[PDB]
Each structure stands twice: as C-alpha cells, then as structure tokens.
C-alpha cells in the first residue's frame, strides 16, 4: 500500500493538533487533508479492536466515521517510526468558523441558528457513537461554503463517553466549565453544553464571553452586541453555573430560539453567497 497513494499539497495549518496538509488521493483525485501527529506529543493513547496501539484520536474518529456528514471522516491512517499520519475528508471550498467570524464579525441570528443547530446535530452524533469531543469551539468547525454544511474537526482532546466523572482535561480553557476550573471535575454532557453556550455567544457577539478564570467562575454574561432576548436566554441557560441547571440537547433544540432553522443549502444561498 504505502503513503504513495497521495499527492501532498500546501500546508493548511499547524498547532496543538499537529501539521495538516492539503492533499489529493491519487487513485481517484479525491480531495483530502493529511494530518501528521508526533508520537512524543500524543498524551492519550487507545487500542483498536485488534490490539494495536494508536492515538485516541484514531479510535474516536473510527467510532464517528460513517454516512453522517456533520463530522469530518477518517478515510485512512498510517504509522511511521515517529508519527501517525491521518487521511481525512476535505471539503472545497472551506473556511473554519474562527476565520469566518474574524472576517465577518458577529453573525446574524438566522445564520447563527443554522450553524448552531448543525453543531448540535454533530455533537449528538458523536455522543450516540460513544464519543465526547471535549474541544468544541469555532476553530474546530469547518464550513463547507458551497453546501452550507458544518463539520467537526480535531478529536485529539476527546475521550470515550462515560457517565462517571472526568478528572482530566486538555481542551481549550476559555471554553471549559466552572466545575473544571474550581474542582478539576466535570461530567461529559453538561461540560459539552457549557462549551456550546460559549460557542453560541461567540457566534452572535463575534467574540468569546470570558477570558479569565474569575469570569468563568462568576458566570455573569454581558452582551456587547444586540442579541434577541430568546438567544440571550438560551445562552444564559447553557452557561448555568450548576451543571444540572443546564439544558439537555433536547431542551436546547426545542428552545424557542431554535425553531424554523434553515436547511444547510438555503443557508449557503442566503449567507455564504453560494
Ligand atoms: O478538510 C480539511 C480538514 O479536514 C482539516 C482538519 C482536519 C482535522 C484537524 O484536526 C485539523 O486541524 C484540520 O483542515 C482543513 C483546512 C483547510 O484550510 C481546508 C480543508 O479542506 C481542511
């Protein structure tokens, strides 16, 4: 087989998620993203059904890879002496939500509703597959600008979903809940809802609501942009200080602010000018 099945293109990005390059599967010109991850920098390892040591990221991706398009799919992976190479889907054209928000500022509520709904559907799919992302944020969401479809990326801080407490976390701090800040303890679902509240605020205000630990613990949300009362209400519910006071995914999707969502294709035609 060998890495020769792909043609490497420009470097797309680099950070705590490794180095990701644009690529093309040679056998059928399929667009792909090629992620290199150094073995030394992988902290959380897992096991494949057959007893092979792979990055947790590979285990989680396999569990969420199938028909549904709300998550970027793992097409293949390789092991090198000092690294792992993951071959992932690559929509074209695409822009991550962080760059999209940097360029356009705060999003109209109609656009934030379509986007947020799609993130909720993707997170539900991950949880239904027994996977917790633990790093939901704008930088980890890609927008397929032609189809108006959002795709979750970088499962490198994720874990298998469980009903017991998590005492470890290596995702983004400014998106982490007060219970992790103060006690180093959180439950998967409620911590995810907290990050979804941070993300929703980020979408409708153009920036995250909290920067310091003190602000997260206090949980007081100030709106810097004009935002409807219903949206503000949903945000404040997602950012409730007590985990049990937060909405479940069902309660979020049945909220009045979430009604009459646009389909992804309508979303692109009206807001992505495509
Ligand atoms: O298709 C793409 C993709 O999958 C990824 C990706 C996947 C997993 C990661 O962990 C990550 O950091 C990036 O980035 C991209 C960046 C681009 O500019 C354009 C793309 O088409 C992709």
Swiss-Prot record:
Annotated phenotype, changing residue 161 to F: Decreased kinase activity
Transmembrane segments: none
Cofactor: Mg(2+)
Residues at the catalytic site: 135
Binding site for ATP: 12-20, 35, 89, 96
Gene3D superfamilies listed in its UniProt record: Phosphorylase Kinase, domain 1, Transferase(Phosphotransferase) domain 1
PROSITE patterns (alphabetical): PROTEIN_KINASE_ATP, PROTEIN_KINASE_DOM, PROTEIN_KINASE_ST
Effect of residue 50 to K: Decreased kinase activity
Reaction it catalyzes: L-seryl-[protein] + ATP = O-phospho-L-seryl-[protein] + ADP + H(+); L-threonyl-[protein] + ATP = O-phospho-L-threonyl-[protein] + ADP + H(+)
EC number: 2.7.11.1
Domain called Protein kinase: residue spans: 6-258
This protein's record includes keyword Cell cycle: yes
Effect recorded for residue 49 to S: Abolished kinase activity
Enzyme class per UniProt: transferase
GO terms for biological process, alphabetical: apoptotic process; cellular detoxification; cellular response to type II interferon; negative regulation of apoptotic process; negative regulation of DNA-binding transcription factor activity; negative regulation of innate immune response; positive regulation of brown fat cell differentiation; positive regulation of cardiac muscle cell proliferation
A GO cellular component entry from the record: nucleoplasm
Post-translational events: Autophosphorylated on both serine/threonine and tyrosine residues. Phosphorylated. Interaction with PPP2CA promotes dephosphorylation.
Gene induction: By interferon-gamma (IFNG). Strongly induced in leukocytes by the JAK/STAT pathway in response to cytokines. Induced by different cellular stresses, heat shock and cytotoxic agents.
Tissue: Expressed primarily in cells of the hematopoietic and germline lineages. Isoform 1 and isoform 2 are both expressed in prostate cancer cell lines.
Modified residues (Phosphoserine): 66, 229
Protein purpose: Proto-oncogene with serine/threonine kinase activity involved in cell survival and cell proliferation and thus providing a selective advantage in tumorigenesis. Exerts its oncogenic activity through: the regulation of MYC transcriptional activity, the regulation of cell cycle progression and by phosphorylation and inhibition of proapoptotic proteins (BAD, MAP3K5, FOXO3). Phosphorylation of MYC leads to an increase of MYC protein stability and thereby an increase of transcriptional activity.
Family label: Belongs to the protein kinase superfamily. CAMK Ser/Thr protein kinase family. PIM subfamily.
Quaternary structure, from the entry: Interacts with RP9. Interacts with HSP90AA1, this interaction stabilizes PIM1 protein levels. Interacts (ubiquitinated form) with HSP70 and promotes its proteasomal degradation.
Name this protein carries in UniProt: Serine/threonine-protein kinase pim-1
């Amino acid at each position: 087989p060998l890495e020769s099945q792909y043609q490497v293109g420009p470097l797309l990005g680099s950070g705590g998620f490794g180095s990701v390059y644009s690529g093309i599967r040679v056998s059928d010109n399929l667009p792909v993203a090629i992620k290199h991850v150094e073995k030394d920098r992988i902290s959380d390892w897992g096991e494949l059904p057959n007893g092979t040591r792979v990055p947790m990221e590979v285990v989680l991706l396999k569990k969420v890879s199938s028909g549904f398009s709300g998550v970027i799919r793992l097409l293949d992976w390789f092991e090198r002496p000092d690294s792992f190479v993951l071959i992932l889907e690559r929509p074209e054209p695409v822009q991550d939500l962080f760059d999209f928000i940097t360029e356009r500022g705060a999003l109209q509520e109609e656009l934030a509703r379509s986007f947020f709904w799609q993130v909720l559907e993707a997170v539900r799919h991950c949880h239904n597959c027994g996977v917790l992302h633990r790093d939901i944020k704008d930088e980890n969401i890609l927008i397929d600008l032609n189809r108006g479809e959002l795709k979750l990326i970088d499962f490198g801080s994720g874990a298998l979903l469980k009903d017991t407490v998590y005492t470890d976390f290596d995702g983004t701090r400014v998106y982490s809940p007060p219970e992790w800040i103060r006690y180093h303890r959180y439950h998967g679902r409620s911590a995810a809802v907290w990050s979804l509240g941070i993300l929703l605020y980020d979408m409708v205000c153009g920036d995250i609501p909290f920067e310091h630990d003190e602000e997260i613990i206090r949980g007081q949300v100030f709106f810097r942009q004009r935002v409807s009362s219903e949206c503000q209400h949903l945000i404040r519910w997602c950012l409730a200080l007590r985990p049990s006071d937060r909405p479940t995914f069902e309660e979020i999707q049945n909220h009045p602010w979430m009604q009459d969502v646009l389909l992804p294709q309508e979303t692109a035609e009206i807001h992505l000018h495509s």
